[PDB]
C-alpha cells in the first residue's frame, strides 16, 4: 500500500473514514486541532471504490477519544485493518467494517491521541497512533 | 500591548524580527516546522515603525536553537524586551536591539523550542517559549 | 481485588510475576530503573497461592520492552488477565498463563514503558502501563 504519516498535532476534531461490510477499512482522513484552529489532514485514499463513508465529528475540545479498537485479518491474502471503533468520553462511534479476525484495543487512561500514520492499498494495511499529554 | 500565542509545533525554520538600536524589539514572526513542512506563523507587529528587520533562516533540521538570551528594561516607562540573541548548534544570531537592562538567558541542555507567545505594543512587552523533546 | 499503582520511573530492569496454567496471572512485581540505580517495586500478591513464579531479568538499558501482549477472559466469573507476553528488542518472554480469551497487544513504535498499575484479587484483574519518551 501507499504509506502515510500525518505527524502530531494538538488534538482531533473530525475523522472521515470509509468501510465495506464485506472487506475492510478503506479511506482515512483526519481534521486535527492545531493550537485551537482546524488543520485539515491529507485524504488517504483506497486504490478502489465501493466504500461507505462516515463522518465522525467530535465536540472538540470537550469530547475526545478514550479508546480505539478494531480487528485485523486477511482480505484477498493481505493482512489489513478490517474494523475500527472510536470510543470517546461521550459516546461510541462504530464499529465500522468487518469485526472478524484478531481484535486489538488501545484504551487511554491518561493522555491524548494527536496523530495517525499508516498505509492504504485496496484497504488500510496498518496504522499507528501518536500519543501525548 | 496586544497579546499573541502561536502555540506549539514540531520545530523552527525561520525567525523574522525587527529591532531598534535605541529602543527595543519590535516585530516578531516565526515560520515553524509542522511535521516536515513549513507552517507560517502570524506576523506580530509593533504599533509603530522605524525598526530594522532581520531574517534568521535556520538550516532545519540540522540546525536548531540551543540558547535564547536578551535583556529586559524600561523604554518610555514600559518594561519591555530590549534585546534578543539566538544561539544555535552552528552559529549565533544577534544580539538584536539594545543590550542594556536586566539580562536573561535560557540554555537548553536537552529539548527544543517549538513555539512562542508574548505581547507587542510599541515594543515586545514580554515573551514565553514552548519546550519539548 | 486490591488496586496497586507503582507510579513512573526511568526504565525497567526486572519483572517478577507468577501464573497458573489453568487460570491466570497471579503475583506481579517490578524492579525499575531509577536514574541508573535499581528501585525495587512493592510485591503485589494474589489472595491465593499455587502459582508458578518466573523472573524476567532484562539487560537494561540495552534491552527494553517493545511489545506487551496477552489475553483477558473469565475465570470463576471474573474478567482477569489470563496471560502475558513481553517482547523486547532481544527476545520474547512468555506467554505465561492461559492463552485463551480476548487477545490484546501493545506494540511500541517510539517510547518506553516506565511503570505499571492495576489490581489483583485471586488473579490480576487488570493492568495499565506508564509510557514516556
Amino acid at each position: 500500500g501507499k504509506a502515510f504519516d500525518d505527524g502530531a498535532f494538538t488534538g482531533i476534531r473530525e475523522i472521515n473514514l470509509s468501510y465495506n461490510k464485506e472487506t475492510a477499512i478503506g479511506d482515512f482522513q483526519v481534521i486535527y486541532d492545531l493550537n485551537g484552529s482546524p488543520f485539515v489532514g491529507q485524504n488517504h485514499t483506497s486504490f478502489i471504490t465501493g466504500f461507505t463513508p462516515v463522518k465522525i465529528s467530535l465536540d472538540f475540545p470537550s469530547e475526545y477519544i478514550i479508546e480505539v479498537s478494531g480487528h485485523t485479518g486477511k482480505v484477498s491474502g493481505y493482512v489489513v485493518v478490517r474494523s475500527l471503533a472510536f470510543k470517546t468520553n461521550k459516546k461510541t462511534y462504530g464499529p465500522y467494517g468487518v469485526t472478524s479476525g484478531t481484535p486489538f484495543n488501545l484504551p487511554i487512561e491518561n493522555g491524548l491521541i494527536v496523530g495517525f500514520k499508516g498505509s492504504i492499498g485496496y484497504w488500510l494495511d496498518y496504522f499507528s497512533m501518536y500519543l501525548s499529554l | 500591548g496586544k497579546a499573541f500565542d502561536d502555540g506549539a509545533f514540531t520545530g523552527i525554520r525561520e525567525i523574522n524580527l525587527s529591532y531598534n538600536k535605541e529602543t527595543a524589539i519590535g516585530d516578531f514572526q516565526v515560520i515553524y516546522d509542522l511535521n516536515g513542512s513549513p507552517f507560517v506563523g502570524q506576523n506580530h507587529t509593533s504599533f509603530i515603525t522605524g525598526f530594522t528587520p532581520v531574517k534568521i533562516s535556520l538550516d532545519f533540521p540540522s540546525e536548531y536553537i540551543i540558547e535564547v538570551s536578551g535583556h529586559t528594561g524600561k523604554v518610555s516607562g514600559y518594561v519591555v524586551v530590549r534585546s534578543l540573541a539566538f544561539k544555535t548548534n552552528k552559529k549565533t544570531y544577534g544580539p538584536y536591539g539594545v543590550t542594556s537592562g536586566t539580562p536573561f538567558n535560557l540554555p537548553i541542555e536537552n529539548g527544543l523550542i517549538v513555539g512562542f507567545k508574548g505581547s507587542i505594543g510599541y515594543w515586545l512587552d514580554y515573551f514565553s517559549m514552548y519546550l519539548s523533546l | 481485588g486490591k488496586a496497586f499503582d507503582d507510579g513512573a520511573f526511568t526504565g525497567i530492569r526486572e519483572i517478577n510475576l507468577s501464573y497458573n496454567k489453568e487460570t491466570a496471572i497471579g503475583d506481579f512485581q517490578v524492579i525499575y530503573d531509577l536514574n541508573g540505580s535499581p528501585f525495587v517495586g512493592q510485591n503485589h500478591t494474589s489472595f491465593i497461592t499455587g502459582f508458578t513464579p518466573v523472573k524476567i531479568s532484562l539487560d537494561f538499558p540495552s534491552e527494553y520492552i517493545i511489545e506487551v501482549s496477552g489475553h483477558t477472559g473469565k475465570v470463576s466469573g471474573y474478567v482477569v488477565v489470563r496471560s502475558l507476553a513481553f517482547k523486547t528488542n532481544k527476545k520474547t518472554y512468555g506467554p505465561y498463563g492461559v492463552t485463551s480469551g480476548t487477545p490484546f497487544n501493545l506494540p511500541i513504535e517510539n517510547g518506553l514503558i516506565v511503570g505499571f498499575k492495576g489490581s489483583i484479587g485471586y488473579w490480576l484483574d487488570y493492568f495499565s502501563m506508564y509510557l514516556s519518551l
Partner: peptide
C-alpha cells in the same frame, strides 16, 4: 532535542500488516 531539530512523540502500533 540533543540530536535533531524535530520534536518527538510517543507512538504506539502498528496494528495490521507487520512490515
Amino acid at each position: 532535542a540533543e540530536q535533531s531539530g524535530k520534536s518527538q512523540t510517543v507512538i504506539v502500533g502498528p496494528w495490521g500488516a507487520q512490515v
